[PDB]
From a paper:
Methionyl-tRNA synthetase (MetRS) charges tRNAMet with l-methionine (L-Met) to decode the ATG codon for protein translation, making it indispensable for all cellular lives. Many gram-positive bacteria use a type 1 MetRS (MetRS1), which is considered a promising antimicrobial drug target due to its low sequence identity with human cytosolic MetRS (HcMetRS, which belongs to MetRS2).
Recently, a series of phenylbenzimidazole inhibitors against SaMetRS were identified through DNA encoded library technology (DELT), and these inhibitors exhibited potent enzyme inhibition and moderate antibacterial activities. A representative compound (named P80 in our study) was synthesized, and its inhibitory activity against SaMetRS was measured. P80 inhibited the pretransfer editing activity of SaMetRS with IC50 = 94.6 ± 6.7 nM. We determined the crystal structure of SaMetRS with P80 at 1.92 Å resolution. Binding of this moiety to the L-Met site did not induce the Trp237 flip like what L-Met did, and maintained an open L-Met site, as observed in F- and A-state SaMetRS. As a result, the CP domain did not bend, keeping the auxiliary pocket in the open conformation.
Residue numbers in the entry: 1 to 520
Write the structure that this text describes.
Amino acid sequence: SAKETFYITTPIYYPSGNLHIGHAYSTVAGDVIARYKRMQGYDVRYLTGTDEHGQKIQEKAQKAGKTEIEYLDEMIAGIKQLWAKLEISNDDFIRTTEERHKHVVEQVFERLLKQGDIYLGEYEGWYSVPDETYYTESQLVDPQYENGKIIGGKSPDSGHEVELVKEESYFFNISKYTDRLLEFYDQNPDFIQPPSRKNEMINNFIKPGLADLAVSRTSFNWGVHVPSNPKHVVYVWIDALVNYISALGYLSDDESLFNKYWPADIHLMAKEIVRFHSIIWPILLMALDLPLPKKVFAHGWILMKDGKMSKSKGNVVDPNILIDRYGLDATRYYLMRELPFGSDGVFTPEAFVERTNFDLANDLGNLVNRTISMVNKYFDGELPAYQGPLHELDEEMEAMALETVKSYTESMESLQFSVALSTVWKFISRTNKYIDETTPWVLAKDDSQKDMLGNVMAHLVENIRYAAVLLRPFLTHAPKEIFEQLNINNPQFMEFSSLEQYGVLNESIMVTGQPKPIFP
Ligand SMILES: CNC(=O)c1ccc2c(c1)nc(-c1ccc(Br)c(O)c1)n2[C@@H](CNC(=O)COc1ccccc1C(C)(C)C)c1ccc(OC)c(OC)c1
């Protein structure tokens, strides 16, 4: 009786200032899924947010001569400005400084304490002061021993000697849920995407035994405090992970969003945090007796020919610069086209320009401009109504249009965005080829071939309309501009349902008398 719901999330971003195209990819990709699911008729909720706690945030605020909230408000303003600039269709933005989040972190922690899933112990970690990163005994390089116990070592990055750090900490005993998690994987084979990551998780993390998780610290203050032991602050594991249910008003005075949208249909994230969403998150939800998420999707990185982009190498590509210089459509298209499923992508300015110029401006932009120009020149702007596949090429081309939609659909549902886009561009290329094959200018000579000329123009515009509709989730400007210039005004003709049967324009239409570039 009601629309089926679809809840999609990106990870909450840690506001350390440097937002590169790698961070933009997650929110753009999430936006594409969100827009696609809305067009399919789902009741969609798309969430993003920020991780605002931890020692480092408060150190950075204090160093800058600001309060924690002053500092964070400025950083979050910048992040939300970028999302608005990328036209991210997120329905909400969760900040971990909000009471709706803090209340959940406190209540979840207290519940696990009362159930006995969390117990007090002592955290022991290997810390590198230069790198400010902790490690387990297992990953120290050139470890030193004494009586069989690891006594120290070298950071597996910097190469500086690590320091043994100890502090009182609450532990979450996750190992007892091991069997339940493996059974969950068995009954939900599509849970982890790409599917190759599942056995890597099992082998590297679950098979060797899940260590108790240190979920609190006593060494810093900026964060959620444990109500029944206020010297303890909740660490990132529970604090960050419950953002996905705290955003829905879980345990608030109004849980209606939580009742409607939980569980999440897809958690989208970069591959380096999929182990936390694949193991810790499901086990935490089991401990709270909540339904698990249906799917976790890990995407690859957008590299340079220096390696991972970072502020430290001066490697960072700024999405603001790309948008200001080349436009939004070009930026979103490049991100979604160049990062294939289960692999990494590689950014170069030359590759960006080729995609932008060859695919968008040339293939799609000139197809629209050539078509509109021919309709203005041969029929004074009045596009003859579609009649049927009159030309010998039409039967196979009309079939290709439907095969394009079908292929696009199975690519999108399998999260293969780059293949969906390449499939659409094969159709755009074929439409340009249709012009060369039919030579409209030759047909415009003979007065006998005026119906055949009208048929060709009708097939050009119907091919364009198919392309425009399929690109609606990816490009936020181009499709609107194409519909505008073609003077296709009817909202129904911009939806997926209007692609079921080829040739919906069975009435004459007057196209723009002043066509302009679709891009930039
Ligand atoms: C010099 N150091 C850094 O540049 C530095 C970099 C990251 C820092 C960080 C400092 N201090 C914090 C921090 C610490 C305490 C609290 Br409470 C908190 O709040 C955040 N973080 C956070 C940043 N937060 C994240 O990346 C958010 O991750 C998630 C998002 C959604 C859901 C789940 C997650 C998890 C955390 C499960 C991946 C952090 C701490 C430890 C981590 O692994 C050991 C980690 O893995 C990606 C992320």
